[PDB]
Design a protein around this ligand. Structure first.
Ligand code: HEM
Ligand code: HEM
Lengths: 145, 145
C-alpha cells in the first residue's frame, strides 16, 4: 500500500531528503523551472501532456510554465514537511496522485521525473545517495498510481 | 485586472499578511481543516462542489478532506512567498484560478472564504485589520476568475 511505502522511509533517508531539500527547495522558481525544462529536454514525448502551458520552450519567460513550476515545488515542500507522520504524508500523496490519475499518468510515466531530479541534485553536488533517497519518495506516489 | 489588484498589496498590507501567516501557517493541518469546516458550516450551499471529498462533516477524520486542507495551506504559503515579486505572484494566482474556473467557481463564491479566514484569524487574536489584509490577497485571485 501507499502507507507501506511511506512507513518504510528510514531516518537516514529522511535526513538525506531534508538536507538536500534545504538547498534545492531554497530557489523554487529557478529549480522548479529547471526540473520541468529538463523533463522536456530528455523526455520529449511528455511535451504533449502539458499543452495547457503553451510553448514550454520559452522557459522562465512562459508565465504559465513558471506558475506551474513554482507550484510543483510546493507539492514537494508539502511532502518533505509530512515525512514524520505517514498518515499525513499518505493523504497528501493520494491528493496529488488524483491530479495525475485524471490526466492518465501511469506510475511508470510519473517515474520519469527521477531523471530531472537526479540532474538538478547533481548541479548542487548532491550525489547518487541523494538521488536514491528522492527516488524512494517518488515511489511513494507511484504506489498510489 | 489581476495586476491592478496585485498593486493594492502595499507595504503595510504585506507586513500584516506575513505577521499573521507566521501564526496560522504554523499549524497547516489544524487551521486548514478549520477553514474548510467553517466554510461548510457557514455556507452549506458550497458543499456540493466538494463531492470528491466524501462526507465533509467528518472533519479531521476524513482523509481526503485532510489532504485537501493541508494542500490548501501550501497554496497560501505560495502566495505569501511571492509577495516580493508581483509578476511571480500573478502567475501562481492564475494557476490556482484555473483550478477553480474548471470547477465553475465564480469570483463571488470564491470570496465566501473570507468569512472563514476572518473567523480563524479571530480565534488566534488577529482582528479586522488582519482579516481585511487577507481579503485584499483573496481579491487578487478573484480578479482572475
Ligand atoms: C516529482 C514529481 C511530480 C510532482 C510532485 C508533480 C506535481 C504536479 C502538480 C502539483 C501539478 C498541478 C496539479 C493541478 O493543479 O491540477 C501537476 C500537474 C501535472 N503533472 Fe505533475 N508532478 C510530477 C511529475 C509528473 C510527470 C513526470 C508527469 C508526466 C510524465 C506529470 C504530468 C502532469 C500533468 C500533465 C499535469 C497537468 C498540467 C496542467 O495542465 O496544468 N507530472 N503535477
Ligand atoms: C483562500 C481561498 C482558496 C484557496 C487558496 C483555494 C485553493 C485550492 C486548492 C489548492 C485546491 C486544489 C486544486 C486541485 O488540485 O485541483 C482547491 C480545490 C478546490 N477548490 Fe479551492 N481554494 C480557495 C477557496 C475556494 C472556495 C471558497 C470554493 C468554493 C466556494 C473552492 C472550491 C474548490 C473546489 C470545488 C475544489 C476541488 C476539490 C476537489 O474535488 O479536490 N475553493 N482549492
Amino acid at each position: 500500500s501507499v502507507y507501506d511505502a511511506a512507513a518504510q522511509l528510514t531516518a537516514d533517508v529522511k535526513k538525506d531528503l531534508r538536507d538536500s531539500w534545504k538547498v534545492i527547495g531554497s530557489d523554487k522558481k529557478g529549480n522548479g523551472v529547471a526540473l520541468m525544462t529538463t523533463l522536456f529536454a530528455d523526455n520529449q514525448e511528455t511535451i504533449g501532456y502539458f499543452k495547457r502551458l503553451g510553448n514550454v520552450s520559452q522557459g522562465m519567460a512562459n508565465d504559465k510554465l513558471r506558475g506551474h513550476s513554482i507550484t510543483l515545488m510546493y507539492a514537494l515542500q508539502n511532502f518533505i514537511d509530512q515525512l514524520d507522520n505517514p498518515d499525513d504524508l499518505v493523504c497528501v500523496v493520494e491528493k496529488f496522485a488524483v491530479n495525475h490519475i485524471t490526466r492518465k499518468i501511469s506510475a511508470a510515466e510519473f517515474g520519469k521525473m527521477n531523471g530531472p531530479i537526479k540532474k538538478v541534485l547533481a548541479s548542487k553536488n548532491f550525489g547518487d545517495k541523494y538521488a536514491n533517497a528522492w527516488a524512494k519518495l517518488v515511489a511513494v506516489v507511484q504506489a498510489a498510481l
